[PDB]
Amino acid sequence: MYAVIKTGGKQHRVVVDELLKVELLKAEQGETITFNDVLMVVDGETVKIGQPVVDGASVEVEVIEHGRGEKIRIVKHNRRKHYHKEQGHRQWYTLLKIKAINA
Amino acid sequence: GLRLNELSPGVGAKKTAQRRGRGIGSGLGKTGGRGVKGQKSRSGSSIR
Amino acid sequence: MEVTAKLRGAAISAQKVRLVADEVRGKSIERALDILTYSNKKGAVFVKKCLNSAIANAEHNHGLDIDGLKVATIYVDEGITLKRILPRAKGRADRISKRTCHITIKVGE
Amino acid sequence: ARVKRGVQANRRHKKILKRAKGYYGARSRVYRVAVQAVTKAGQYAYRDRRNKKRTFRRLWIARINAGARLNGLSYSRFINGMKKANITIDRRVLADIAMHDAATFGALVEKAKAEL
Amino acid sequence: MKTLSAKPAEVTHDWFVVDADGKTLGRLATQIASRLRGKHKTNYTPHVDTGDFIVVINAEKIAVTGKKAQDKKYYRHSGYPGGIKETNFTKLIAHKPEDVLHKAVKGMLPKGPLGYAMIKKLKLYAGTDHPHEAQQPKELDI
RNA sequence: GGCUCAAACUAGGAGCCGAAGCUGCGGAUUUGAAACUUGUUUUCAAGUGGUAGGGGAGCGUUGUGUAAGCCUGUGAAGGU
RNA sequence: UGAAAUAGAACCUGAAACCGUGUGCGUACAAGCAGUAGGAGCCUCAAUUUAUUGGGGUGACUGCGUACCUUUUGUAUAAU
Numbered sequence: 001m002y003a004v005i006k007t008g009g010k011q012h013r014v015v016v017d018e019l020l021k022v023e024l025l026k027a028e029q030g031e032t033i034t035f036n037d038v039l040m041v042v043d044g045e046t047v048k049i050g051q052p053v054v055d056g057a058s059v060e061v062e063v064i065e066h067g068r069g070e071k072i073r074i075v076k077h078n079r080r081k082h083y084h085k086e087q088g089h090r091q092w093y094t095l096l097k098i099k100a101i102n103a
Numbered sequence: 104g105l106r107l108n109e110l111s112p113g114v115g116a117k118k119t120a121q122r123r124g125r126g127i128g129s130g131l132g133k134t135g136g137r138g139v140k141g142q143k144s145r146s147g148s149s150i151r
Numbered sequence: 152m153e154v155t156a157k158l159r160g161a162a163i164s165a166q167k168v169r170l171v172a173d174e175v176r177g178k179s180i181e182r183a184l185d186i187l188t189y190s191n192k193k194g195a196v197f198v199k200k201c202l203n204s205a206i207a208n209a210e211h212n213h214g215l216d217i218d219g220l221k222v223a224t225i226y227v228d229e230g231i232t233l234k235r236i237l238p239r240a241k242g243r244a245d246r247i248s249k250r251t252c253h254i255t256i257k258v259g260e
Numbered sequence: 261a262r263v264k265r266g267v268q269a270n271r272r273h274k275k276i277l278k279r280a281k282g283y284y285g286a287r288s289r290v291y292r293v294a295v296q297a298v299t300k301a302g303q304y305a306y307r308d309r310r311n312k313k314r315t316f317r318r319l320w321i322a323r324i325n326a327g328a329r330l331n332g333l334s335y336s337r338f339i340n341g342m343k344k345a346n347i348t349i350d351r352r353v354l355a356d357i358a359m360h361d362a363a364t365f366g367a368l369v370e371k372a373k374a375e376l
Numbered sequence: 377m378k379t380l381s382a383k384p385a386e387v388t389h390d391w392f393v394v395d396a397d398g399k400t401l402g403r404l405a406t407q408i409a410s411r412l413r414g415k416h417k418t419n420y421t422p423h424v425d426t427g428d429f430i431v432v433i434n435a436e437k438i439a440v441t442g443k444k445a446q447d448k449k450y451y452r453h454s455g456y457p458g459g460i461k462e463t464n465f466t467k468l469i470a471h472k473p474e475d476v477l478h479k480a481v482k483g484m485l486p487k488g489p490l491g492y493a494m495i496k497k498l499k500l501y502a503g504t505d506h507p508h509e510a511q512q513p514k515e516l517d518i
Numbered sequence: 519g520g521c522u523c524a525a526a527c528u529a530g531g532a533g534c535c536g537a538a539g540c541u542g543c544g545g546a547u548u549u550g551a552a553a554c555u556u557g558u559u560u561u562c563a564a565g566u567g568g569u570a571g572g573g574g575a576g577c578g579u580u581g582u583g584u585a586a587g588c589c590u591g592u593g594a595a596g597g598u
Numbered sequence: 599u600g601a602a603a604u605a606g607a608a609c610c611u612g613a614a615a616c617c618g619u620g621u622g623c624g625u626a627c628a629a630g631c632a633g634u635a636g637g638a639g640c641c642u643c644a645a646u647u648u649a650u651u652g653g654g655g656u657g658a659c660u661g662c663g664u665a666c667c668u669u670u671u672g673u674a675u676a677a678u
């Protein structure tokens with residue numbers, strides 16, 4: 001049992017009880033989200049490929065928390081041009097636990 | 104009538120001065136706004 | 152335990168004493184003493200003196216059996232340099248480093 | 261009000277030398293060399309954040325091409341067949357399926373080949 | 377979900393035989409180079425050698441089109457002044473016939489340590505026989 | 519490398535690859551506009567490569583006051 | 599002896615350059631600003647009902663990649 005779902009402009013192949021980091025979601029911690037635009041469900045030797053979505057199939061996830069990622073130093077340097085600039089970055093993510101995949 | 108600890112000059116009252124030649128980020132490093140090597144970039148230069 | 156001797160301030164370069172130290176590192180006290188007494192290098196007299204002092208320390212201050220001892224660790228460190236002037240041709244001077252070295256020896260089972 | 265620069269200069273140089281840990285020779289030891297190596301490392305990392313998105317699509321496309329040719333199709337016909345079948349599976353997921361689930365990728369190739 | 381690499385210990389290299397008799401040199405060499413690199417595998421990762429072992433027989437009977445048998449020249453430099461040597465396709469195939477296909481494939485492989493590793497798997501033999509019957513290579517038309 | 523009914527050329531067609539371009543998702547910021555309205559809130563639109571150079575906002579350091587305070591041998595400064 | 603002796607007289611603290619010793623990993627078929635983005639293996643701490651994750655060290659192998667300042671129309675420049 002696995003499914004292909006969409007979150008955050010990205011696609012994820014997921015299985016049940018997997019912990020997945022995705023782009024930050026406007027969803028309270030501990031709440032359950034249902035994805036009803038799953039792209040494929042493979043629950044064994046049976047393959048349901050959506051064109052573009054598998055109608056009826058749904059993946060329920062729960063929000064564990066919203067965190068910030070690892071700091072990245074962004075360094076820009078123009079040599080001989082008296083130019084330098086540094087910047088910090090931490091990307092927000094939300095962590096989802098895949099609770100159920102219904103084909 | 105407040106404390107000596109909590110008087111403020113008010114917004115716009117104070118401006119920080121420019122310090123030339125204190126790095127790239129300040130916007131006044133190296134030449135200090137004088138541009139490149141002519142008579143005006145030199146030390147005792149004036150506008151006669 | 153490990154018993155130490157220090158020979159701070161030997162009038163010789165540590166680069167020279169290091170060749171001697173590399174050959175006695177890890178050996179038994181007897182083999183190391185043989186190597187040191189029959190070496191032709193000046194650094195061996197210093198390493199032998201420091202090793203003998205460490206053996207005597209282990210036998211007198213700690214009551215160890217020197218029959219089971221070994222050079223557990225040895226290293227040479229740079230000491231203080233004496234700075235001298237060397238005249239050269241055409242009135243030019245050079246500096247001379249008269250290097251000294253510190254020898255640390257620890258013997259143990 | 262005389263200001264001594266020692267303490268701040270020390271901590272400033274320690275930040276750079278800390279970022280230069282693991283570099284060879286003077287690049288992890290001496291500040292004049294470490295500070296250039298840190299700046300160049302940041303420059304490379306900035307460029308390679310962009311280039312890694314290209315490299316991984318390169319890899320996915322290679323794996324998809326291999327998977328499709330195992331099933332009797334080329335990459336450029338398989339992707340066209342997916343776009344004609346209205347299948348929105350990304351190259352990252354398609355490459356994952358091709359690598360780790362051969363029968364499902366066979367099914368996807370069958371759908372694309374029926375669309376052509 | 378992450379994109380995984382092939383984990384060298386988990387890769388197996390299969391053995392195949394290619395009969396070079398009457399095939400075009402470059403067109404056969406492209407297929408051999410792809411097989412040696414492992415491009416036909418869905419676990420292909422550029423830093424891992426996932427290729428196969430290609431055994432090639434009848435390497436002297438490889439064919440070139442046009443007047444390339446007499447006009448394709450192989451140069452080398454010895455490292456000594458004026459030390460540029462030239463041989464022919466026909467003379468090279470008379471002298472060391474496995475060199476022709478080895479050169480074609482070596483140019484088509486990556487030029488580094490992994491390329492050197494992956495050309496080790498190319499086994500060339502002039503004539504109909506090869507000594508690798510213990511590896512049981514399967515016939516591969518390519 | 520190598521290529522000859524091409525892996526060349528000519529004329530057409532269909533696919534695909536391909537950039538920091540465009541789109542998607544998340545975040546920041548400048549200006550302007552609307553409203554609990556000196557960040558109080560949300561939005562929206564257009565922007566955000568940059569030398570000389572102009573403009574704006576800050577960080578740290580020494581010292582004075584706040585401070586006969588507060589911290590500190592149950593461990594200050596400094597070092598790592 | 600002393601609170602303290604890597605406070606022992608070159609004596610408070612005791613940075614860096616520089617030079618040793620020890621441990622772990624890598625390295626003797628491979629070409630270049632020495633990193634970076636990936637990435638196998640090994641080593642080590644922790645969890646975990648037990649070789650899977652997480653942290654740390656190393657980095658086989660792949661892609662990309664000609665220091666910095668100054669001065670210039672323009673510099674990897676074999677210009678300073």
Ligand SMILES: [Mg+2]
Pocket residue numbers: 612
């Ligand atoms: Mg002291």
